[PDB]
């Protein structure tokens, strides 16, 4: 499940945010940072969504429709997957999480999103999901992150590394050190989401890919 360190920086223009409640939290901080740069933001992030829940809410359809409504969107920001690492049933066909056919389906759903952005001539920033507190869930999200990074690499878009920045001694931590080497609570007590400070740190990681 090993990825790469993405050193890509883009020169900047409207933004579109998609994803789940992780994106909803990051979006509060990232909207403010982009607003400070006179950048327009459309934030569609929506709780209880994910690529595995495509039949309930299809992010590929919603993203395409957003581009059709606003041809000035040139950057897509994606953060999702917290709801996704579970078996998928399609009709009478069953796909166990992490199995080869499951990975095929999930990879296709990731690729759909990137293909739609490319068709509309937009570039993609895709966030790595940072570590979560529950060990079994954390192992599964590392599988998701490998798929995101593989598909972002093949499509030559931008992968935002988050694992190192939200770990202490290569493990989940609710607290990290700030720019002044002081301890700050960046994760909420559910061991998944972000405090305002954590959201700001996630936003900074995207901004470090913009020149």
Q: Length of the chain in residues, anyone?
A: 211
**β-bridge mates for residue 183, sequence order:** 177
Residue 109: which of 57, 47, 46, 162 has the closest Cα? Answer: 57
d(CA 103, CA 50): 15
If you classify domain 14-208 with CATH, what class do you get?
A: alpha beta
Tokens of 15: 């933004």
d(CA 85, CA 87): 7
Is residue 132 within 8 A of residue 100, CB to CB? The reply is no
Q: Give the max Cα distance, the chain.
A: 55
The DSSP letter of residue 187 is B
Torsion 104-105-108-113 (CA) sign? negative
Torsion 199-205-32-148 (CA) sign? negative
Is residue 30 within 8 A of residue 203, CB to CB? The reply is yes
d(CA 22, CA 187): 11
Tell me how crowded residue 174 is: count the other CB atoms within 10 A of its CB: 16
d(CA 53, CA 46): 12
Tokens of 143: 């599988």
For the chain, which residues make up each domain, given as ranges?
A: 14-208
β-bridge pairing 158-160 and 123-127: parallel
E strand intervals along the chain = 14-19, 40-43, 73-79, 88-90, 93-95, 123-127, 158-160, 167-168, 171-172, 175-177, 183-185
d(CA 1, CA 132): 16
- What is the CB-side half-sphere exposure of residue 141 using CA atoms within 13 A? 22
Between helices 196-207 and 21-35, what is the axis angle to 10°? 60
E strand intervals along 117-174 = 123-127, 158-160, 167-168, 171-172
DSSP string, 8-45: --B---EEEEEESHHHHHHHHHHHHHHHTTT-EEEE--
């Amino acid at each position: 499940n090993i990825s790469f360190i993405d050193n890509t920086k883009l020169e900047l223009d409207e933004f579109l945010f998609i994803g789940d409640s992780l994106m909803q939290g990051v979006a509060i901080a990232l909207n403010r940072d982009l607003r400070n740069l006179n950048l327009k933001v459309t934030d569609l992030s929506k709780q209880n969504t994910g690529l595995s829940y495509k039949s309930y809410f299809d992010w590929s359809k919603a993203t395409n429709e957003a581009f059709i409504k606003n041809s000035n969107i040139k950057y897509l920001v994606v953060l999702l997957g917290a709801n996704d690492p579970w078996d998928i049933k399609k009709g009478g066909n069953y796909h166990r999480f992490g199995s080869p056919s499951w990975i095929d389906i999930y990879t296709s759903r990731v690729d759909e999103i990137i293909k739609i952005a490319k068709k509309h001539k937009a570039k993609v920033f895709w966030f790595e999901i940072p570590p979560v507190k529950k060990e079994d869930l954390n192992k599964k999200i590392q599988v998701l992150n490998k798929i995101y990074s593989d598909e972002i690499l093949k499509n030559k878009e931008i992968f935002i590394n988050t694992k190192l920045f939200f770990s202490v001694n290569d493990e989940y931590s609710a607290y990290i050190k700030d720019e002044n080497n002081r301890s700050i609570k960046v994760r909420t007590d559910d061991g998944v989401h972000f405090t305002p400070s954590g959201a700001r740190e996630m936003s900074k990681l995207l901004l470090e890919h913009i020149k």
